Write a protein that binds this ligand. Structure first.
Ligand code: NA
Lengths: 11, 105
């Protein structure tokens, strides 16, 4: 439940 | 099998990871890897960052384990070992908030 960052995916 | 890390901190929780990274003078991109505190068997990559609002802070990324071996943060960039993952992201951010600049001192 704590906040984790994600790698953004761009199209 | 070559056996070999300054950046690996084992069973270190999120809170204590942040205390070590937010030591005075550590640059953005100071980092460590630790066991995941909330997904058993996975790892967490903790990275010092900065923005104008939060100031100095830490971002955490889940390093997932592939079912049959290997690791990734995003499914399109997979690595056999944590060392190879660290070397990759030390060379380019590739979607992380910044590069892995220096292991937590
Ligand atoms: Na430190």
């Amino acid at each position: 439940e704590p906040q984790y960052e994600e790698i953004p995916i761009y199209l | 099998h070559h056996s070999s890390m300054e950046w690996y901190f084992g069973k270190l929780g999120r809170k204590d990871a942040e205390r070590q990274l937010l030591s005075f003078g550590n640059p953005r991109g100071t980092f460590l890897i630790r066991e995941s505190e909330t997904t058993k068997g996975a790892y967490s990559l903790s990275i010092r960052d900065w923005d104008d609002m939060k100031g100095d802070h830490v971002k955490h990324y889940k390093i997932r384990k592939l079912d049959n071996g290997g690791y990734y943060i995003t499914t399109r960039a997979q690595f056999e070992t944590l060392q190879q993952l660290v070397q990759h992201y030390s060379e380019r951010a590739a979607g992380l908030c910044c590069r892995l600049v220096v292991p937590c001192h």
